[PDB]
Amino acid sequence: AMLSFEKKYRVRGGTLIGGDLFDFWFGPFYVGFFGVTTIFFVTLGTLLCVWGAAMGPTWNLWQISIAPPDLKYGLGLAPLREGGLWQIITLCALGAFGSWALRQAEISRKLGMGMHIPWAYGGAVLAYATLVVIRPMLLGAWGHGFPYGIFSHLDWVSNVGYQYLHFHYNPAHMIAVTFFFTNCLALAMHGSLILSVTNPKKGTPVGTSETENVFFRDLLGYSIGAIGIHRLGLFLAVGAAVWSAICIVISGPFWTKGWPEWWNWWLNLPI
Amino acid sequence: MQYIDGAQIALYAFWLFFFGLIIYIRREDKREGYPLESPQGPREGWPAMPEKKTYIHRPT
Amino acid sequence: MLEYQNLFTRVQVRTVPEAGIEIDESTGTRYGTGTFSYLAGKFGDAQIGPIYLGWAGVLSLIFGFMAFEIIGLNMWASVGWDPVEFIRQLPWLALEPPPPQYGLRVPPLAQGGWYLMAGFFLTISILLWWVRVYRRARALNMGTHLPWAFASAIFLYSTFFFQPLLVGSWSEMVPFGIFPHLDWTSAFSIRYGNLYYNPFHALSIAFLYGSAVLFAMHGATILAVARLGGEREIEQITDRGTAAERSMLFWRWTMGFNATMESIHRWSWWFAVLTTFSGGIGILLTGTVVDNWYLWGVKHGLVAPYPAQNTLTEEQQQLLRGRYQGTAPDSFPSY
Amino acid sequence: MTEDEARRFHGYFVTGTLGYIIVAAVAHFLAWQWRPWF
Amino acid sequence: HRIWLMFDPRRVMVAMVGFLAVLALVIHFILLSSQRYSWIENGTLSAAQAPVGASA
Amino acid sequence: HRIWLMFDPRRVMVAMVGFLAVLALVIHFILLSSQRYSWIENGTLSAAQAPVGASAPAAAAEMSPLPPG
Amino acid sequence: HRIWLMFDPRRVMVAMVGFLAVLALVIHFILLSSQRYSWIENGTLSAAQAPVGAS
Amino acid sequence: TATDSVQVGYRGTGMEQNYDHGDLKKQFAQVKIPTPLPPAGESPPGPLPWQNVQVLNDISVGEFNRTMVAMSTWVAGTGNCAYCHNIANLAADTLPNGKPLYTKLVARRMLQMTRQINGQYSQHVKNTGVTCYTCHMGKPLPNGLWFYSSQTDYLRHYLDRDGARVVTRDVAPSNANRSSVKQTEWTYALMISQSRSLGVNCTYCHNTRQFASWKEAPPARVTAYHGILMLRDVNQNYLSPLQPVYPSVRLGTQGDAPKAQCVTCHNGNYKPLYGAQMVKDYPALWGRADWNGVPFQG
Amino acid sequence: PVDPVTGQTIINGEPVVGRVFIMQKTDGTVKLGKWQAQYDGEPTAPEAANVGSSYTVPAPEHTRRMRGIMIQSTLWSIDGKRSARERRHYRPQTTGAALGQ
Ligand SMILES: CCCCCCCCCCCCCC(=O)OC[C@H](COP(=O)(O)OCC(O)COP(=O)(O)OC[C@@H](COC(=O)CCCCCCCCCCCCC)OC(=O)CCCCCCCCCCCCC)OC(=O)CCCCCCCCCCCCC
Ligand SMILES: CCCCCCCCCCCCCC(=O)OC[C@H](COP(=O)(O)OCC(O)COP(=O)(O)OC[C@@H](COC(=O)CCCCCCCCCCCCC)OC(=O)CCCCCCCCCCCCC)OC(=O)CCCCCCCCCCCCC
Ligand code: BCL
Ligand code: BCL
Ligand code: BCL
Ligand SMILES: CC[C@H]1c2cc3[nH]c4c(c3C)C(=O)[C@H](C(=O)OC)c4c3nc(cc4[nH]c(cc(n2)[C@@H]1C)c(C(C)=O)c4C)[C@@H](C)[C@@H]3CCC(=O)OC/C=C(\C)CCC[C@H](C)CCC[C@H](C)CCCC(C)C
Ligand SMILES: CC[C@H]1c2cc3[nH]c4c(c3C)C(=O)[C@H](C(=O)OC)c4c3nc(cc4[nH]c(cc(n2)[C@@H]1C)c(C(C)=O)c4C)[C@@H](C)[C@@H]3CCC(=O)OC/C=C(\C)CCC[C@H](C)CCC[C@H](C)CCCC(C)C
Ligand SMILES: COC(C)(C)C/C=C/C(C)=C/C=C/C(C)=C/C=C/C(C)=C/C=C\C=C(C)\C=C\C=C(C)\C=C\C=C(C)\C=C\CC(C)(C)OC
Ligand code: HEC
Ligand code: HEC
Ligand SMILES: [Fe+3]
């Protein structure tokens, strides 16, 4: 099945690895070399997640938890019973996340597009890599990563946040939250703006680009561009993930005490 | 009753609302490029493609 | 070297400022003429244009400035009117809610009366701003999607009034302060047993992350086809060009399914709205239907098992029993 | 690049590389006299 | 040599200097963080007094 | 002298000054945060009285810097 | 001299004054935060009574 | 930085303690422990030759002198009998001019306080009791001295206020628990102080997924609770009643005696003095019949 | 039980070839049950709060200007400025008649 305009776009070329062997479509999906690599890592990682569930006490979806090894194993590959299975799944996830990004770059190259989508996705991958690779390496043990469980990884976030007695006082966390909140507000504004022009008051014609700019100047005194809003949305969403990666990588590797005590520098200014 | 409580009822009402909303948005997603072309003939997923939507333009 | 990533604008045009589409000016008017910012034109549109002011806007500004003045003056009085301490300690200062024993009755002025007055004025200002947004939308013959998107956030904001009233005390309200409202957030989660196990809280988390994911995806997609004219979304909606086709095809080949140039904005709208809607429901159920979300999660099979880290003997079980917190001592005893 | 200045560059690169290694060898000789690591 | 017809001398020289500077800084900071070669504090000690790892 | 036809002199000075200034500040601040060379506080002590790092140390019994775990 | 041909004097002057102003503030503030040279508090002490680091 | 991590809970739960290597090494090095005095356990079995000894009435003369030199070096520095005594007559509780020697009354009361801590609160100081050194650190004034400030000061949790629980033991709200968010903030502040007094975080004593659970928490929480009780017995019965003995310079602005908290003994460490054991070599200080099965000479 | 001669484990009267261990899940974890069951092995419910039957108004010098609950642990525990510590409380007051004015 193809869209009514899809046939003329399904051409060869644009791949980073391979030729006509991996230049086909399986149903709607495009399969490249990195499509094949994605399926390998997804299948291996998911099957090992199912095995970790079978080793545990329950099949309940919310209660399944595959935990990282103890801190005493210290950057080694622990026994698979004792957390080594978590490390293997982590490698499969890294390979699948990397393959997904490279597969996206191949698709945009075939369509004559920019490379923005792979790099925007790389912000999320960087945050994940900080959580399970960079910060655990700086702290010296793979056991500093979070467990793989729907509600188990919420317990990790709670306990890690309270390792600094008040995680709200983290300066980088405060900035990252502002990025997340502003992004949600801007997305609601952008979604409303396009829909209100395209679906206007009943019986009236569809509005124009002037209508958007006039409306937001009337409301706020300033109207970002049609390209400005898409630049801002990319900046807010990706910057939220980048500031999240900073906020967690400075807790422990750089700051070990409580986060409220960090604000001594502001209170001890000479003035 | 005893096991059933207000939070669970509200959660399931939200689940029904979310599934309805997803069906509506998926219907809206099929307003361009449909019906699909296949060797076996025309194809539409669930939800089916909606009626043709026409816009209104200002007079010249 | 690298291609043009459409991240900034190097060549900017200047014309006469856009005065604006003619609208009804009986109960309001446009102020200013429209200036141009060179720094703002690099990122988006350069015009710092005229702003519309009417009945609802003026009333909203008056009420909101009254609330802001009350909050700031109470903050300043809390440091003894010291300007150096006012700036130095500003993140830690607060306008605190009334004491718990007053319930919903009127507190003393220095012990929560100012708080309630400022909250009332802020609520009136927010509602008047909603009216202003609605009127601005319908003056240009636009649809009212932004008013209802704003109403969702107003609903979440108003749960911070309705939950304390449902539990029966204004002491449970959010203090006005940078660090203090974070303190309230933490203590509210602790008091009601780990808000991570509130299902509507998890739902709002999911919609917040989904909003970030959707905006990253849409922004990258539009910037990737901006050289084909994809940033003119209204045109690509009423007359589908090759930029919309390429966006659709990219996401269909990547994911197996896609949206249109119009319905991706519906996705965005609904994710952003559902964030605050589910959050407001979750806050409303806390302390009124469920008093311990961890125990509710244990009830409904949400809590993963861990090995026990301690065990207590029966005498230890009786001794380690504590007391619920009560009143502070109003006397200084002599021993 | 006329392939002839590559020979000119190679002589300078080789002497600079070998001279840097000899100087670093003396630095390791001095550090050994101060505090041997074996 | 013919290798410079294959690799740009400027790109190689910049990359090599950047690698050597990073390598030198890493080694100096690894020794500084160690106990035996924390020379800013214990550098005046003789080789017999310098700390040695445990025989265990 | 020929190295200036391979690298722009303006770029090298800016890179040189930036690297030397950063390195000088890093070394000065590393010494200032140490115990032996905190010259602002202890600069008037002679070499005999200046602090020295611990030599090959002894052990301790029942005293641990880290809690059990 | 010929350095002003390679570098604009106006740009050099601004960068130099900005660097010197920052350096002087950093040194003055580092001494103010110390114990031996907290001159606003202990400036009237003689050199023998001024604080000295331990050992 | 170099970080030291100690795992205190189950793997993957996030229950860990972090320390900066440089700060911890410096703090461990700077702490010095006084070497124990050579034992003196041979004396004739005769009557006690003393005039005004009311606490150390079951201790041999040689042990008496040993522990009293130990008290001197623990509190007032080596020698320095003049901090608590008239040199000419050590049996005098008053100065020649008539005014009492308040230091000697305080020391006599705090011998009893140390014995009470070691004997009746082994559930906290188990096999690692306290001497004068643990609080005094070789100086007359210990750390963590607090006085009457205001009604809402959380340190009064250690004097005369009981009750800190705010979490409901049910799924549905009832009148059994009507704790406010503000009381939760009060408990949060008290526990922030407790964490900072030991150099640990929340997870040292809690699984923060449920703060009210003891089964999911490390055993230290139980120990911590006992500490609170012990403080309420030291502050109410020993430190506070000493109010009419101090000079005015030792009291607070309300004229109350100094009181102690967790940081008075711990000084920012998980154990006082990193768990050094000293009282085992000083039988006059522990009010037990046997320390580790080592009998009390009597 | 163990065979007296061979040492083999016997299960339902049949010997087992191998070293028998009792099967368990990951680190001996057991699925949770009802929420009430969370309180077995835990201390019993805490006693009712101590609520004063009367209130006496403290002197102004004993009253905090700041009404934030966590101000003592988040700011004051790290702030040592004497001016701020002075501003922390209200100042003593009197009347003009008491001063003779
Ligand atoms: C929320 C509401 C909506 C929720 C839902 C949202 C859905 C979103 C997506 C929308 C589209 C879905 C439909 C779709 O993808 O259809 C594809 C296909 C039609 O494909 P086609 O158009 O005929 O194919 C075109 C083209 O590929 C023709 O090539 P050819 O015909 O030569 O195919 C060669 C392929 C296939 O040969 C194989 O052997 C592949 C078999 C894959 C499935 C079985 C897996 C297990 C055995 C594995 C092999 C064993 C040895 C043979 O050969 C290839 O190599 C193709 C690429 C394969 C992937 C890359 C290589 C990976 C190699 C490493 C990993 C190996 C496996 C571990 O049609 C169907 O399969 C019909 C059924 C569709 C509905 C799904 C039914 C699922 C049932 C099971 C559900 C289980 C739930 C847990
Ligand atoms: C607490 C405060 C919170 C926070 C506050 C919450 C407040 C309520 C928010 C509700 C959602 C609003 C969504 C939205 O886009 O709003 C902007 C729109 C702007 O419209 P306008 O400016 O008046 O004019 C624009 C209009 O011409 C075009 O609007 P657009 O197309 O963008 O969206 C409006 C409609 C779509 O319109 C159509 O479909 C009409 C097309 C021609 C007729 C269709 C064929 C004939 C059908 C006949 C049978 C059908 C006849 C209806 O979109 C919507 O209204 C949203 C639809 C998706 C959401 C519902 C999905 C299903 C949910 C249930 C699932 C159940 C389980 C399966 O404003 C409106 O009021 C739109 C109309 C809303 C209709 C439903 C009202 C429901 C009220 C319920 C409570 C009433 C008191 C008890
Ligand atoms: C515990 C560790 C020791 C110590 C052990 C070492 C050791 C061992 C070495 C260094 C080296 C260096 N150390 Mg160290 N170092 C210590 C403390 C310091 C401190 C400090 C503030 O404490 C500083 C600033 C330095 C700084 C330096 C640099 C000078 C140098 C690393 C960069 C480099 O390659 O430069 C490049 C600098 C140069 C001078 C290179 C000059 C190269 C030219 C091309 C030579 C030309 C020769 C001629 C023309 C050709 C002959 C050709 C044929 C042979 C005939 N060290 C402490 C006390 N350090 C390395 C080094 O290179 O030392 C020389 C090295 O191997
Ligand atoms: C007691 C607990 C603490 C606390 C402790 C922490 C800790 C600890 C951390 C955060 C982090 C974050 N916190 Mg918190 N936090 C608290 C309270 C809050 C509050 C609030 C209202 O009070 C807010 C808004 C936030 C906000 C946030 C964000 C800034 C950030 C999470 C986003 C992120 O990292 O995305 C980044 C995105 C990702 C990691 C996702 C990557 C996804 C990958 C690439 C792809 C997955 C694909 C998937 C497998 C596909 C599946 C199959 C298909 C569906 C078919 N915190 C309290 C005070 N917070 C986290 C952070 O910064 O992390 C970096 C973090 O670790
Ligand atoms: C220890 C702390 C607790 C916790 C306690 C809470 C509490 C308590 C709440 C949340 C809520 C939220 N939390 Mg949580 N949260 C924690 C951990 C997290 C983590 C994480 C990293 O683990 C994340 C990602 C989040 C994320 C989120 C959001 C999804 C959600 C708020 C939505 C929103 O847009 O709010 C921002 C949007 C608004 C406030 C809407 C209203 C805005 C108004 C209209 C603005 C008016 C401004 C006015 C005009 C200008 C200023 C005027 C002056 C004041 C005078 N929390 C832990 C478990 N969280 C909320 C929720 O819904 O929970 C169910 C909530 O109340
Ligand atoms: C700018 C940063 C934000 C963002 C952006 C972003 N995400 C993106 C993109 C972009 C721009 C894509 O293009 C990409 C995409 O294709 O979307 C359709 C994607 C995407 N974002 C996703 C999810 C996601 N993003 C998140 C975060 C965010 N993404 C940030 C907020 C989160 C969070 C916060 O939790 C999630 C869950 C996917 C839907 C998709 C990437 C799909 C992908 O990588 O697929 C390949 C892998 C699989 C199909 C499964 C692999 C399974 C593993 C092998 C085993 C288990 C893995 C994991 C360790 C399990 C842990 C579970 C527990 C934590 C519960
Ligand atoms: C979909 C949910 C998200 C959402 C949506 C949303 N918010 C919205 C809207 C929408 C759709 C609007 O239409 C509306 C709007 O107009 O946006 C531009 C609004 C809005 N969201 C706002 C804020 C906001 N939204 C937030 C969050 C969110 N908004 C959600 C994430 C938050 C958070 C994270 O807490 C905040 C703070 C406002 C910008 C605006 C509503 C404006 C309003 O109601 O104003 C009332 C007026 C006053 C209070 C008067 C204030 C007076 C000044 C304080 C005094 C000035 C004195 C002096 C002149 C200057 C002093 C300078 C200092 C103050 C710096
Ligand atoms: C010189 O400077 C001056 C003083 C002149 C001006 C300066 C002012 C400054 C610096 C102000 C600073 C303000 C700051 C920092 C404010 C911070 C605000 C924050 C962070 C607020 C965060 C959250 C607050 C919330 C969520 C509050 C919600 C309150 C509500 C919903 C209250 C509702 C109350 C109602 C409806 C009351 C009704 C009254 C009746 C009597 C009807 O019911 C009781
Ligand atoms: C304050 C901490 C003291 C120091 C520095 C010294 N002693 Fe000393 N002394 C102190 C206390 C509380 C008592 C009474 C103990 C009790 O009542 O149980 C004493 C008493 C004595 C005595 C016996 C008094 C008598 O004969 O009636 C002696 C002989 C004595 N103290 C000696 C002594 C020595 C040798 C010290 C070493 C420098 C010393 N004291 C210091 C309190 C303190
Ligand atoms: C060991 C020294 C602990 C540290 C570190 C933390 N807490 Fe704790 N907690 C501890 C005890 C002994 C008690 C009971 C005290 C009593 O008088 O009953 C508590 C109790 C709490 C509670 C209340 C639990 C309830 O059922 O209501 C909370 C909410 C709590 N603690 C939180 C908390 C926080 C936020 C901490 C770090 C800042 C923290 N605890 C550390 C022992 C110890
Ligand atoms: Fe858009």
Side-chain angles (χ1 to χ4, degrees), chain E residues 34-45:
Chain E
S34 87
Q35 279 204 324
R36 181 171 169 88
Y37 291 103
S38 213
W39 73 89
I40 278 157
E41 315 272 29
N42 68 14
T44 47
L45 300 180

PDB file of all heavy atoms in Angstrom, chain E residues 34-45:
ATOM      1  N   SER E  34      46.761  10.637  41.573  1.00  0.00           N
ATOM      2  CA  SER E  34      47.272   9.460  42.250  1.00  0.00           C
ATOM      3  C   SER E  34      47.908   9.848  43.582  1.00  0.00           C
ATOM      4  O   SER E  34      48.082  11.024  43.904  1.00  0.00           O
ATOM      5  CB  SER E  34      48.280   8.731  41.367  1.00  0.00           C
ATOM      6  OG  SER E  34      49.580   9.256  41.537  1.00  0.00           O
ATOM      7  N   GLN E  35      48.252   8.831  44.368  1.00  0.00           N
ATOM      8  CA  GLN E  35      48.879   9.056  45.662  1.00  0.00           C
ATOM      9  C   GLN E  35      50.394   9.138  45.564  1.00  0.00           C
ATOM     10  O   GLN E  35      51.008   9.999  46.201  1.00  0.00           O
ATOM     11  CB  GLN E  35      48.482   7.946  46.637  1.00  0.00           C
ATOM     12  CG  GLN E  35      47.122   8.143  47.269  1.00  0.00           C
ATOM     13  CD  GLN E  35      46.983   7.418  48.589  1.00  0.00           C
ATOM     14  OE1 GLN E  35      47.509   6.319  48.766  1.00  0.00           O
ATOM     15  NE2 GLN E  35      46.267   8.028  49.526  1.00  0.00           N
ATOM     16  N   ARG E  36      51.011   8.266  44.769  1.00  0.00           N
ATOM     17  CA  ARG E  36      52.465   8.230  44.705  1.00  0.00           C
ATOM     18  C   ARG E  36      53.037   9.433  43.964  1.00  0.00           C
ATOM     19  O   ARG E  36      54.124   9.906  44.308  1.00  0.00           O
ATOM     20  CB  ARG E  36      52.924   6.927  44.052  1.00  0.00           C
ATOM     21  CG  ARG E  36      54.429   6.778  43.950  1.00  0.00           C
ATOM     22  CD  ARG E  36      54.820   5.388  43.503  1.00  0.00           C
ATOM     23  NE  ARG E  36      56.233   5.304  43.158  1.00  0.00           N
ATOM     24  CZ  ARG E  36      57.202   5.034  44.020  1.00  0.00           C
ATOM     25  NH1 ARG E  36      56.947   4.809  45.296  1.00  0.00           N
ATOM     26  NH2 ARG E  36      58.457   4.983  43.589  1.00  0.00           N
ATOM     27  N   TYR E  37      52.329   9.953  42.966  1.00  0.00           N
ATOM     28  CA  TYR E  37      52.854  10.996  42.095  1.00  0.00           C
ATOM     29  C   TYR E  37      52.026  12.272  42.169  1.00  0.00           C
ATOM     30  O   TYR E  37      51.886  12.999  41.187  1.00  0.00           O
ATOM     31  CB  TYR E  37      52.953  10.493  40.658  1.00  0.00           C
ATOM     32  CG  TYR E  37      54.022   9.451  40.494  1.00  0.00           C
ATOM     33  CD1 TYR E  37      53.702   8.106  40.392  1.00  0.00           C
ATOM     34  CD2 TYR E  37      55.358   9.809  40.474  1.00  0.00           C
ATOM     35  CE1 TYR E  37      54.681   7.154  40.258  1.00  0.00           C
ATOM     36  CE2 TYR E  37      56.340   8.866  40.343  1.00  0.00           C
ATOM     37  CZ  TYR E  37      55.998   7.541  40.235  1.00  0.00           C
ATOM     38  OH  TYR E  37      56.986   6.606  40.105  1.00  0.00           O
ATOM     39  N   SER E  38      51.476  12.570  43.345  1.00  0.00           N
ATOM     40  CA  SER E  38      50.829  13.858  43.592  1.00  0.00           C
ATOM     41  C   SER E  38      51.912  14.879  43.940  1.00  0.00           C
ATOM     42  O   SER E  38      52.052  15.338  45.074  1.00  0.00           O
ATOM     43  CB  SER E  38      49.792  13.733  44.695  1.00  0.00           C
ATOM     44  OG  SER E  38      48.703  14.605  44.467  1.00  0.00           O
ATOM     45  N   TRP E  39      52.685  15.241  42.913  1.00  0.00           N
ATOM     46  CA  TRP E  39      53.962  15.915  43.112  1.00  0.00           C
ATOM     47  C   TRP E  39      53.823  17.312  43.700  1.00  0.00           C
ATOM     48  O   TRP E  39      54.777  17.809  44.304  1.00  0.00           O
ATOM     49  CB  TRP E  39      54.722  15.982  41.785  1.00  0.00           C
ATOM     50  CG  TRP E  39      54.170  16.976  40.802  1.00  0.00           C
ATOM     51  CD1 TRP E  39      54.509  18.290  40.692  1.00  0.00           C
ATOM     52  CD2 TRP E  39      53.190  16.730  39.788  1.00  0.00           C
ATOM     53  NE1 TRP E  39      53.800  18.879  39.680  1.00  0.00           N
ATOM     54  CE2 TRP E  39      52.981  17.942  39.109  1.00  0.00           C
ATOM     55  CE3 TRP E  39      52.467  15.604  39.392  1.00  0.00           C
ATOM     56  CZ2 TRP E  39      52.084  18.058  38.053  1.00  0.00           C
ATOM     57  CZ3 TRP E  39      51.579  15.721  38.346  1.00  0.00           C
ATOM     58  CH2 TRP E  39      51.394  16.938  37.688  1.00  0.00           C
ATOM     59  N   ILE E  40      52.678  17.968  43.529  1.00  0.00           N
ATOM     60  CA  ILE E  40      52.529  19.316  44.066  1.00  0.00           C
ATOM     61  C   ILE E  40      52.553  19.287  45.590  1.00  0.00           C
ATOM     62  O   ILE E  40      53.093  20.192  46.235  1.00  0.00           O
ATOM     63  CB  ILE E  40      51.252  19.972  43.511  1.00  0.00           C
ATOM     64  CG1 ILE E  40      51.523  20.548  42.123  1.00  0.00           C
ATOM     65  CG2 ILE E  40      50.755  21.069  44.429  1.00  0.00           C
ATOM     66  CD1 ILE E  40      50.293  20.701  41.277  1.00  0.00           C
ATOM     67  N   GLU E  41      52.002  18.234  46.189  1.00  0.00           N
ATOM     68  CA  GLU E  41      52.000  18.101  47.639  1.00  0.00           C
ATOM     69  C   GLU E  41      53.186  17.292  48.155  1.00  0.00           C
ATOM     70  O   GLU E  41      53.914  17.760  49.034  1.00  0.00           O
ATOM     71  CB  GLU E  41      50.684  17.473  48.099  1.00  0.00           C
ATOM     72  CG  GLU E  41      49.454  18.069  47.433  1.00  0.00           C
ATOM     73  CD  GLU E  41      48.907  19.286  48.163  1.00  0.00           C
ATOM     74  OE1 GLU E  41      49.693  20.010  48.807  1.00  0.00           O
ATOM     75  OE2 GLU E  41      47.685  19.521  48.088  1.00  0.00           O
ATOM     76  N   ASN E  42      53.405  16.089  47.625  1.00  0.00           N
ATOM     77  CA  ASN E  42      54.409  15.182  48.168  1.00  0.00           C
ATOM     78  C   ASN E  42      55.694  15.130  47.349  1.00  0.00           C
ATOM     79  O   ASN E  42      56.528  14.256  47.591  1.00  0.00           O
ATOM     80  CB  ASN E  42      53.824  13.771  48.328  1.00  0.00           C
ATOM     81  CG  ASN E  42      53.510  13.084  47.001  1.00  0.00           C
ATOM     82  OD1 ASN E  42      53.943  13.507  45.935  1.00  0.00           O
ATOM     83  ND2 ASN E  42      52.754  12.003  47.078  1.00  0.00           N
ATOM     84  N   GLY E  43      55.879  16.047  46.399  1.00  0.00           N
ATOM     85  CA  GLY E  43      57.023  15.983  45.504  1.00  0.00           C
ATOM     86  C   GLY E  43      58.371  16.085  46.188  1.00  0.00           C
ATOM     87  O   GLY E  43      59.371  15.630  45.629  1.00  0.00           O
ATOM     88  N   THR E  44      58.424  16.669  47.382  1.00  0.00           N
ATOM     89  CA  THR E  44      59.683  16.813  48.101  1.00  0.00           C
ATOM     90  C   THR E  44      60.097  15.547  48.839  1.00  0.00           C
ATOM     91  O   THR E  44      61.218  15.492  49.353  1.00  0.00           O
ATOM     92  CB  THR E  44      59.602  17.975  49.094  1.00  0.00           C
ATOM     93  OG1 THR E  44      58.383  17.888  49.840  1.00  0.00           O
ATOM     94  CG2 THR E  44      59.643  19.299  48.368  1.00  0.00           C
ATOM     95  N   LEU E  45      59.230  14.542  48.907  1.00  0.00           N
ATOM     96  CA  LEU E  45      59.583  13.282  49.544  1.00  0.00           C
ATOM     97  C   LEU E  45      60.593  12.516  48.702  1.00  0.00           C
ATOM     98  O   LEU E  45      60.624  12.624  47.475  1.00  0.00           O
ATOM     99  CB  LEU E  45      58.341  12.421  49.753  1.00  0.00           C
ATOM    100  CG  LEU E  45      57.221  12.995  50.612  1.00  0.00           C
ATOM    101  CD1 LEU E  45      56.079  12.007  50.691  1.00  0.00           C
ATOM    102  CD2 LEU E  45      57.731  13.338  51.992  1.00  0.00           C
TER     103      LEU E  45
END
